[PDB]
Amino acid sequence: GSIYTFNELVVLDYPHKDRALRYLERLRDDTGIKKIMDSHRWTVPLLSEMDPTLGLNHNQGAHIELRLRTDRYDGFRDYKTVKSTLIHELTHNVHGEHDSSFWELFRQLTKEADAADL
Ligand code: NI
């Protein structure tokens, strides 16, 4: 497999953490996410669940965090929304500020990752 992936997944110590882990695995394995990480040559050492401000990118892709939960028991955010937050965080591998260049790349990555054939 490709080196352009998330090398380690981490979830928090909340009820149904096995479900949070499956959520991160789904994002890592998402064909659209893989396409853009391959196209843009991104390796992210760590992808974590953010404590339940919907995502973070630390040090240009050393570590990305995503808020998966809507509460502290079994409420989770919808996949489409979290996937798009992940694309936002990946865009911060290149652009620090939410400027025109950021949003241009965000739109291009979004289109790639949403392609109908994947
Ligand atoms: Ni941002």
Numbering used by the authors: 1 to 52, 62 to 127
What is the paper's account of this structure, in its own sentences?
Covalent DNA-protein crosslinks (DPCs) are toxic DNA lesions that interfere with essential chromatin transactions, such as replication and transcription.
An anomalous dataset at the Ni2+ edge (z = 1.4854) confirmed that this ion occupies the active site of the enzyme, where it replaced the catalytic zinc presumably during the Ni2+-affinity chromatography. The overall architecture depicted a compact protease domain consisting of four tightly packed α helices and a four-stranded antiparallel β sheet.
